[PDB]
Amino acid sequence: MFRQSSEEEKKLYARLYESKLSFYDLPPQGEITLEQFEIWAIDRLKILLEIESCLSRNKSIKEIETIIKPQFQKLLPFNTESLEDRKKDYYSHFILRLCFCRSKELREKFVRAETFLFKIRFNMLTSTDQTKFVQSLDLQFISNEEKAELSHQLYQTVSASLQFQLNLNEEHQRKQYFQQEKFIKLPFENVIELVGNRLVFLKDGYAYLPQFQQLNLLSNEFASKLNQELIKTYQYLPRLNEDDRLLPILNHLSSGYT
């Protein structure tokens, strides 16, 4: 049969937003303006302020998504090929690190709001994008034999969840889905919020988690790594103090949370 046969910064941000979301993993390079610094930080700050306001009003995920999604096209676009939007998103996150690393209360508020925004944007993805994003983060499934041995317990655990979360009211549909579903085994301490609600099966100190759940692990890893990075950011704030032109902006940004 027949057969034939700075740019680096732009490539970096194309790579960082191929997954459409990022853990915000890497040091930015090159330059932007100081006006851009202020405006981009304020835009992300407005979205996070509304997220915290809605959470203080005890609104649900669906309501917050209805409130916040129209704001992306104006303040902080998502699911976009534009280099400007990608740089705006990335840089605004990094700026608010330096604003909100300053104290435990600021770190907690910023981690909460940013993790909830992460959850919102992850919900906006297609399942293929979610899979690719999770795989890009280098993030144990059980064997078919172990699934067969624990099938009664796992099905008893997830059958209600399949009906209420995936709308599978028919038991036949639940059985077919369960036959196609994969399960993850990890220590129970890693998914303790699901343990307290008895949403996972426990055996010998390990929790058995279906593949259609477990986004709380992803968002908790995002929150934990962001908290550690903020702690690091706090430790080298004395180097930020070398440019005076940034400190009034950061003081202004933090004043809306104090």
């Binding site: 317990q153 008893q156 655990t157 059958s159 209600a160 220590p187 129970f188 301490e189 303790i192 919020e193 343990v195 307290g196 609600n197 008895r198 099966f201 426990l202 055996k203 010998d204 100190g205 390990y206």
Partner: protein
């Protein structure tokens, strides 16, 4: 006061308790930084004590001579040095995961005794609660290094000392507690909130409690022989209003039928009412109500205040209960409160023999020594596995 002084000087097992709390024969931060609190007959209570060694621990408890002392968390720095620290600088690192069960929580269905009084008839509540809890701790959480302790009058305390259990945060402790807390509302005027089909924990607990429901609830305690108590506790757990009204009317016309008789009346009247194509569904719902009643009556009941915080302080093992005089001994599922030693009896036995090993306290000391030996062996094995994994 003199009896307590004699007790600490002659009877309390300081060496075994030190080995348990220190997790090592040689001293460590697990004892040096562990908070202890002492309660006194004057009404005084002193927090933030900690001890450098078994000799220091024994000497300070003997010198203070409290009515009891209580065990708290392991800290980042010695609690006895808190005067050198700001309040924000002294922080907890570990504490044994502890569960607390009280007999008074079963007075919704207990009859032979009420309040802080106890007997072997009702302690079957605590024995089954211990059995279900032990099954959960071993099969679900994989724990092995735990022991139960009699509270001295009316309850039982489980002290879990596995390294992964000791390291749980407050959030993790609250969620573990929620996992094992099934009867989250004690009020009797509703059916349980549990979803169906059962989570495997609930199903296994029900199958473990089913053989004992007749003998304990319907026959031994028999709380529903009183018609008003049945109308107030048994009927609200049922799913249907016509069934409830029919049972209420029938029992008001036919009073003082026993709990077993009422339990059968539920089935008979439901069979009489729910004929036709929907009969299978009604039988299933009735069976669900009875299963939920078994869990409502016999499942473990827990004090959330003991488990929900790492920094909490609780009466230590082998303490003396101030009212009853009982020793707060270690126990197992076959225990009853009538088997506990008392301070006066142990003083008498020591006056006669002058040897602790010949007193009634020594079997309990043997249980604790075996537990400490197993705990230390598992700790050393865990350190070896961690070192091999690091290598």
């Amino acid at each position: 006061s003199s009896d307590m002084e004699y007790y600490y000087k002659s009877l309390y097992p300081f060496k075994h308790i030190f080995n348990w709390l220190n997790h090592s024969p040689k001293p460590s931060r697990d004892m040096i930084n562990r908070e202890f609190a002492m309660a006194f007959r004057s009404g005084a209570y002193k927090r933030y004590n900690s001890f450098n060694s078994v000799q220091d621990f024994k000497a300070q408890i003997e010198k203070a001579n409290p009515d009891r002392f209580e065990i708290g968390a392991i800290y980042n720095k010695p609690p006895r040095e808190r005067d050198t620290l700001l309040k924000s600088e002294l922080k907890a690192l570990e504490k044994e995961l502890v569960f607390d069960i009280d007999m008074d929580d079963y007075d919704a269905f207990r009859t032979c005794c009420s309040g802080a009084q106890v007997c072997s008839k009702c302690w079957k509540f605590i024995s089954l609660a211990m059995k279900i809890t032990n099954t959960a701790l071993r099969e679900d959480f994989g724990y092995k290094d735990f022991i139960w302790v009699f509270s001295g009058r009316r309850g039982a305390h489980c002290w879990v000392s596995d390294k992964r259990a000791r390291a749980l945060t407050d959030v993790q402790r609250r969620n573990v507690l929620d996992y094992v807390n099934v009867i989250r509302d004690r009020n009797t005027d509703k059916r349980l909130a549990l979803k169906r089909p059962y989570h495997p924990h609930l199903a296994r607990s029900l199958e473990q409690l089913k053989p004992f429901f007749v003998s304990i609830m319907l026959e031994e305690q028999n709380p529903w022989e009183d018609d008003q108590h049945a109308i107030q506790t048994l009927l609200p757990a049922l799913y249907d209003k016509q069934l409830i009204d029919s049972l209420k009317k029938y029992w008001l016309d036919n009073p003082r039928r026993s709990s077993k008789e009422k339990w059968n009346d539920i089935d008979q009247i439901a069979t009489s009412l729910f004929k036709g194509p929907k009969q299978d569904s009604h039988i299933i719902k009735l069976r669900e109500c009875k299963e939920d009643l078994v869990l409502m009556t016999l499942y473990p009941k827990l004090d959330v205040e003991v488990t929900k915080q790492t920094i909490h302080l609780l009466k230590a093992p082998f303490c003396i209960h101030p009212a009853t005089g009982n020793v707060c001994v270690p126990i197992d599922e076959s225990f009853a409160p009538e088997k506990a030693p008392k301070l006066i009896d142990l003083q008498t036995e020591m006056e006669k023999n002058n040897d602790v090993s010949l007193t009634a306290l020594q079997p309990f000391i043997n249980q604790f020594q075996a537990y400490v030996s197993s705990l230390l062996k598992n700790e050393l094995g865990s350190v070896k596995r961690e070192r091999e994994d690091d290598d």
